[PDB]
Design a protein around this ligand. Structure first.
Ligand SMILES: Cc1nc(C)c(-c2ccnc(N)n2)s1
Length: 290
Protein backbone atom coordinates (compact mmCIF):
# COMPACT_ATOMS: atom_id res chain seq x y z
CA UNK A 1 0.00 0.00 0.00
CA UNK A 2 3.03 2.30 0.42
CA UNK A 3 2.96 2.57 -3.40
CA UNK A 4 -0.39 4.39 -3.32
CA UNK A 5 -1.30 7.84 -2.11
CA UNK A 6 -4.95 8.42 -1.13
CA UNK A 7 -6.45 11.47 -2.83
CA UNK A 8 -10.02 11.31 -1.41
CA UNK A 9 -12.72 8.92 -0.22
CA UNK A 10 -15.15 8.33 -3.07
CA UNK A 11 -17.62 6.03 -1.47
CA UNK A 12 -18.52 3.18 0.76
CA UNK A 13 -18.71 -0.05 -1.21
CA UNK A 14 -20.37 -3.34 -0.24
CA UNK A 15 -17.08 -4.70 1.23
CA UNK A 16 -15.12 -1.64 2.30
CA UNK A 17 -14.14 1.93 1.70
CA UNK A 18 -13.26 3.08 -1.86
CA UNK A 19 -10.61 5.72 -2.38
CA UNK A 20 -9.37 7.65 -5.34
CA UNK A 21 -5.59 7.16 -5.14
CA UNK A 22 -2.38 7.76 -7.12
CA UNK A 23 -0.06 4.86 -8.04
CA UNK A 24 3.38 6.35 -7.43
CA UNK A 25 5.10 3.85 -9.74
CA UNK A 26 2.93 4.36 -12.81
CA UNK A 27 1.55 7.87 -12.01
CA UNK A 28 -1.83 6.28 -12.57
CA UNK A 29 -4.95 7.56 -10.76
CA UNK A 30 -6.95 4.50 -9.56
CA UNK A 31 -9.89 3.41 -7.48
CA UNK A 32 -8.53 1.52 -4.49
CA UNK A 33 -10.94 -0.83 -2.63
CA UNK A 34 -10.42 -2.35 0.84
CA UNK A 35 -12.12 -5.72 1.10
CA UNK A 36 -8.00 -13.80 3.10
CA UNK A 37 -9.52 -17.19 2.11
CA UNK A 38 -7.54 -18.90 -0.64
CA UNK A 39 -10.70 -19.51 -2.66
CA UNK A 40 -11.31 -15.72 -2.88
CA UNK A 41 -7.71 -15.06 -3.96
CA UNK A 42 -7.94 -17.56 -6.76
CA UNK A 43 -11.36 -16.28 -7.96
CA UNK A 44 -10.24 -12.69 -7.92
CA UNK A 45 -7.04 -13.54 -9.73
CA UNK A 46 -9.13 -15.09 -12.53
CA UNK A 47 -10.95 -11.73 -12.90
CA UNK A 48 -7.58 -10.00 -13.80
CA UNK A 49 -7.80 -11.58 -17.18
CA UNK A 50 -11.52 -10.96 -17.83
CA UNK A 51 -10.78 -7.78 -19.85
CA UNK A 52 -13.26 -5.91 -22.04
CA UNK A 53 -13.82 -2.21 -22.90
CA UNK A 54 -17.18 -2.24 -21.04
CA UNK A 55 -15.77 -3.86 -17.89
CA UNK A 56 -13.95 -1.62 -15.39
CA UNK A 57 -10.37 -2.90 -15.54
CA UNK A 58 -9.02 -4.77 -12.51
CA UNK A 59 -5.44 -3.50 -12.38
CA UNK A 60 -4.14 -5.48 -9.40
CA UNK A 61 -4.96 -7.57 -6.44
CA UNK A 62 -2.79 -6.85 -3.38
CA UNK A 63 -2.87 -9.32 -0.37
CA UNK A 64 -0.94 -7.98 2.76
CA UNK A 65 -0.98 -8.19 6.65
CA UNK A 66 -4.02 -10.47 6.17
CA UNK A 67 -5.60 -7.92 3.86
CA UNK A 68 -6.99 -7.58 0.38
CA UNK A 69 -6.95 -4.44 -1.73
CA UNK A 70 -8.34 -4.29 -5.21
CA UNK A 71 -6.99 -1.68 -7.58
CA UNK A 72 -9.34 -0.67 -10.39
CA UNK A 73 -9.41 1.71 -13.28
CA UNK A 74 -10.95 5.02 -12.09
CA UNK A 75 -13.98 6.57 -13.74
CA UNK A 76 -15.32 9.94 -12.77
CA UNK A 77 -19.09 9.35 -12.55
CA UNK A 78 -21.68 6.61 -11.82
CA UNK A 79 -25.04 6.15 -13.48
CA UNK A 80 -26.92 6.80 -10.22
CA UNK A 81 -25.46 10.30 -9.98
CA UNK A 82 -25.99 10.89 -13.70
CA UNK A 83 -29.64 9.83 -13.49
CA UNK A 84 -30.19 12.10 -10.45
CA UNK A 85 -28.57 15.00 -12.34
CA UNK A 86 -30.71 14.28 -15.45
CA UNK A 87 -33.97 14.05 -13.45
CA UNK A 88 -35.64 17.21 -14.67
CA UNK A 89 -35.02 16.47 -18.29
CA UNK A 90 -34.35 12.69 -18.54
CA UNK A 91 -31.32 11.05 -20.12
CA UNK A 92 -31.86 11.39 -23.91
CA UNK A 93 -33.13 8.16 -25.58
CA UNK A 94 -30.13 7.87 -27.92
CA UNK A 95 -27.86 7.92 -24.87
CA UNK A 96 -30.04 5.40 -22.98
CA UNK A 97 -29.82 3.18 -26.05
CA UNK A 98 -26.03 3.57 -26.34
CA UNK A 99 -25.59 2.75 -22.64
CA UNK A 100 -27.85 -0.30 -22.82
CA UNK A 101 -26.03 -1.53 -25.92
CA UNK A 102 -22.63 -1.15 -24.29
CA UNK A 103 -23.74 -2.81 -21.04
CA UNK A 104 -25.13 -5.76 -23.03
CA UNK A 105 -21.73 -6.08 -24.73
CA UNK A 106 -20.01 -6.23 -21.35
CA UNK A 107 -22.48 -8.87 -20.13
CA UNK A 108 -22.20 -10.92 -23.35
CA UNK A 109 -18.40 -10.99 -22.89
CA UNK A 110 -18.48 -12.01 -19.21
CA UNK A 111 -21.30 -14.48 -19.69
CA UNK A 112 -19.40 -16.16 -22.58
CA UNK A 113 -16.72 -16.92 -19.97
CA UNK A 114 -19.41 -18.17 -17.52
CA UNK A 115 -18.86 -15.26 -15.11
CA UNK A 116 -21.88 -13.50 -13.62
CA UNK A 117 -22.11 -10.15 -11.81
CA UNK A 118 -25.21 -10.83 -9.63
CA UNK A 119 -25.36 -7.38 -8.10
CA UNK A 120 -25.80 -4.89 -10.95
CA UNK A 121 -27.15 -1.54 -9.87
CA UNK A 122 -26.70 2.08 -11.04
CA UNK A 123 -23.92 2.68 -8.53
CA UNK A 124 -21.68 0.10 -10.19
CA UNK A 125 -22.27 1.34 -13.73
CA UNK A 126 -19.54 3.91 -14.37
CA UNK A 127 -19.43 6.51 -17.14
CA UNK A 128 -16.80 8.69 -18.81
CA UNK A 129 -16.89 11.92 -20.79
CA UNK A 130 -16.42 9.95 -24.11
CA UNK A 131 -19.83 8.27 -23.97
CA UNK A 132 -18.62 4.92 -22.56
CA UNK A 133 -20.27 3.04 -19.72
CA UNK A 134 -18.63 0.16 -17.86
CA UNK A 135 -19.61 -2.50 -15.35
CA UNK A 136 -17.78 -2.24 -12.03
CA UNK A 137 -17.15 -4.94 -9.46
CA UNK A 138 -17.83 -7.70 -11.85
CA UNK A 139 -17.42 -11.16 -10.28
CA UNK A 140 -16.89 -9.94 -6.70
CA UNK A 141 -20.21 -11.45 -5.52
CA UNK A 142 -19.00 -15.00 -6.22
CA UNK A 143 -15.58 -14.23 -4.75
CA UNK A 144 -16.98 -12.66 -1.50
CA UNK A 145 -20.83 -13.19 -1.36
CA UNK A 146 -23.69 -10.61 -1.40
CA UNK A 147 -24.38 -9.66 2.22
CA UNK A 148 -27.60 -8.25 3.65
CA UNK A 149 -25.77 -5.15 4.95
CA UNK A 150 -22.50 -3.58 3.92
CA UNK A 151 -19.48 -3.10 6.15
CA UNK A 152 -21.04 0.25 7.30
CA UNK A 153 -24.43 -1.48 8.00
CA UNK A 154 -26.02 0.10 4.91
CA UNK A 155 -28.77 -1.99 3.40
CA UNK A 156 -27.73 -3.74 0.16
CA UNK A 157 -30.42 -2.82 -2.35
CA UNK A 158 -32.99 -5.40 -3.48
CA UNK A 159 -34.35 -3.29 -6.31
CA UNK A 160 -32.53 -5.07 -9.14
CA UNK A 161 -32.69 -8.61 -7.78
CA UNK A 162 -34.10 -11.33 -10.04
CA UNK A 163 -37.22 -13.20 -8.90
CA UNK A 164 -35.46 -16.58 -8.88
CA UNK A 165 -33.02 -15.27 -6.29
CA UNK A 166 -35.91 -13.90 -4.13
CA UNK A 167 -37.68 -17.26 -4.45
CA UNK A 168 -34.65 -19.13 -3.08
CA UNK A 169 -33.02 -20.65 -6.16
CA UNK A 170 -29.54 -21.64 -5.17
CA UNK A 171 -28.09 -22.23 -8.67
CA UNK A 172 -28.90 -19.22 -10.66
CA UNK A 173 -27.65 -18.28 -14.12
CA UNK A 174 -26.42 -15.41 -16.22
CA UNK A 175 -30.13 -14.49 -16.61
CA UNK A 176 -29.97 -12.74 -13.22
CA UNK A 177 -27.85 -10.01 -14.79
CA UNK A 178 -30.28 -9.53 -17.69
CA UNK A 179 -33.11 -9.01 -15.18
CA UNK A 180 -31.08 -6.37 -13.31
CA UNK A 181 -30.17 -4.60 -16.51
CA UNK A 182 -33.85 -4.60 -17.63
CA UNK A 183 -34.78 -2.92 -14.34
CA UNK A 184 -32.06 -0.28 -14.97
CA UNK A 185 -33.24 0.28 -18.55
CA UNK A 186 -36.76 0.95 -17.28
CA UNK A 187 -35.39 3.35 -14.64
CA UNK A 188 -33.42 5.35 -17.20
CA UNK A 189 -36.53 5.69 -19.37
CA UNK A 190 -39.07 6.61 -16.70
CA UNK A 191 -36.75 8.41 -14.22
CA UNK A 192 -38.06 6.26 -11.34
CA UNK A 193 -36.93 2.90 -10.02
CA UNK A 194 -39.08 0.10 -11.43
CA UNK A 195 -39.32 -2.11 -8.28
CA UNK A 196 -38.06 -0.14 -5.23
CA UNK A 197 -38.65 -2.89 -2.62
CA UNK A 198 -37.72 -2.37 1.00
CA UNK A 199 -37.81 -6.05 2.09
CA UNK A 200 -37.69 -9.32 0.25
CA UNK A 201 -41.45 -9.75 0.26
CA UNK A 202 -42.06 -6.12 -0.73
CA UNK A 203 -39.61 -6.62 -3.62
CA UNK A 204 -41.36 -9.79 -4.75
CA UNK A 205 -44.86 -8.33 -4.46
CA UNK A 206 -43.83 -5.21 -6.37
CA UNK A 207 -42.61 -7.46 -9.19
CA UNK A 208 -45.88 -9.44 -9.05
CA UNK A 209 -48.11 -6.39 -9.13
CA UNK A 210 -46.48 -5.20 -12.40
CA UNK A 211 -45.71 -8.49 -14.18
CA UNK A 212 -48.49 -10.62 -12.66
CA UNK A 213 -48.07 -13.26 -9.98
CA UNK A 214 -46.10 -16.03 -11.69
CA UNK A 215 -47.65 -19.45 -12.10
CA UNK A 216 -46.89 -22.75 -13.72
CA UNK A 217 -48.10 -21.52 -17.11
CA UNK A 218 -45.56 -18.72 -17.45
CA UNK A 219 -42.84 -20.25 -15.25
CA UNK A 220 -42.86 -24.06 -15.10
CA UNK A 221 -41.52 -25.17 -11.72
CA UNK A 222 -42.08 -21.84 -9.96
CA UNK A 223 -44.55 -23.26 -7.44
CA UNK A 224 -41.97 -25.67 -6.12
CA UNK A 225 -39.23 -23.12 -5.47
CA UNK A 226 -37.99 -22.90 -1.87
CA UNK A 227 -39.61 -19.61 -0.91
CA UNK A 228 -42.71 -19.84 -3.08
CA UNK A 229 -45.93 -19.71 -1.01
CA UNK A 230 -49.33 -20.82 -2.46
CA UNK A 231 -50.77 -18.01 -0.33
CA UNK A 232 -49.07 -15.30 -2.43
CA UNK A 233 -51.77 -12.96 -3.70
CA UNK A 234 -52.67 -13.31 -7.41
CA UNK A 235 -52.15 -10.02 -9.26
CA UNK A 236 -52.86 -9.44 -12.95
CA UNK A 237 -50.05 -8.40 -15.30
CA UNK A 238 -49.80 -4.72 -16.51
CA UNK A 239 -49.24 -3.72 -20.13
CA UNK A 240 -45.75 -2.37 -20.71
CA UNK A 241 -47.32 0.62 -22.45
CA UNK A 242 -48.42 1.62 -18.89
CA UNK A 243 -45.14 0.73 -17.22
CA UNK A 244 -42.54 2.49 -19.39
CA UNK A 245 -44.12 5.30 -21.48
CA UNK A 246 -42.84 6.83 -23.85
CA UNK A 247 -40.64 3.87 -24.80
CA UNK A 248 -41.39 2.66 -28.35
CA UNK A 249 -42.51 -0.81 -29.27
CA UNK A 250 -39.00 -2.09 -30.03
CA UNK A 251 -37.84 -0.94 -26.58
CA UNK A 252 -40.91 -2.40 -24.87
CA UNK A 253 -40.42 -5.73 -26.73
CA UNK A 254 -36.81 -5.91 -25.60
CA UNK A 255 -37.62 -4.94 -22.02
CA UNK A 256 -40.36 -7.53 -21.81
CA UNK A 257 -37.89 -10.22 -22.88
CA UNK A 258 -35.34 -9.04 -20.31
CA UNK A 259 -38.03 -9.35 -17.62
CA UNK A 260 -39.39 -12.80 -18.45
CA UNK A 261 -40.03 -14.74 -15.27
CA UNK A 262 -38.56 -18.07 -16.39
CA UNK A 263 -34.80 -17.52 -16.47
CA UNK A 264 -34.49 -20.11 -19.25
CA UNK A 265 -36.87 -17.88 -21.45
CA UNK A 266 -35.25 -14.59 -20.51
CA UNK A 267 -33.33 -13.12 -23.44
CA UNK A 268 -29.51 -13.60 -23.45
CA UNK A 269 -27.14 -10.64 -23.73
CA UNK A 270 -25.99 -11.92 -27.11
CA UNK A 271 -29.55 -12.20 -28.43
CA UNK A 272 -30.44 -8.79 -26.99
CA UNK A 273 -27.60 -7.17 -28.98
CA UNK A 274 -29.30 -8.37 -32.19
CA UNK A 275 -32.67 -6.91 -31.18
CA UNK A 276 -34.20 -4.36 -33.62
CA UNK A 277 -34.15 -1.73 -30.82
CA UNK A 278 -30.40 -1.38 -31.63
CA UNK A 279 -30.91 -0.80 -35.37
CA UNK A 280 -30.26 2.91 -35.02
CA UNK A 281 -27.80 2.83 -32.09
CA UNK A 282 -25.14 5.58 -31.94
CA UNK A 283 -22.59 6.73 -29.34
CA UNK A 284 -23.49 10.24 -28.15
CA UNK A 285 -21.29 12.43 -25.89
CA UNK A 286 -23.08 12.87 -22.49
CA UNK A 287 -23.69 16.25 -20.87
CA UNK A 288 -21.43 15.90 -17.75
CA UNK A 289 -19.61 17.98 -15.08
CA UNK A 290 -16.42 17.74 -12.95
C1 LIG B 1 -19.17 3.06 -3.84
C2 LIG B 1 -18.38 2.97 -5.13
N1 LIG B 1 -18.59 2.00 -6.00
C3 LIG B 1 -17.77 2.05 -7.10
C4 LIG B 1 -18.01 1.01 -8.09
C5 LIG B 1 -16.87 3.12 -7.10
C6 LIG B 1 -15.91 3.45 -8.10
C7 LIG B 1 -15.63 4.79 -8.41
C8 LIG B 1 -14.67 5.14 -9.35
N2 LIG B 1 -14.05 4.17 -10.03
C9 LIG B 1 -14.29 2.87 -9.70
N3 LIG B 1 -13.68 1.91 -10.32
N4 LIG B 1 -15.24 2.48 -8.78
S1 LIG B 1 -17.16 4.05 -5.65
Amino acid sequence: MENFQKVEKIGEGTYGVVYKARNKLTGEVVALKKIVPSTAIREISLLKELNHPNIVKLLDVIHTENKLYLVFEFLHQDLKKFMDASALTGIPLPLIKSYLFQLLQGLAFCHSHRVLHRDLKPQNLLINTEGAIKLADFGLARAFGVPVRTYTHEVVTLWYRAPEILLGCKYYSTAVDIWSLGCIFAEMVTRRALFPGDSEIDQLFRIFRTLGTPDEVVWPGVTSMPDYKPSFPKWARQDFSKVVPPLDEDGRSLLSQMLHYDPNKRISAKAALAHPFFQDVTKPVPHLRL
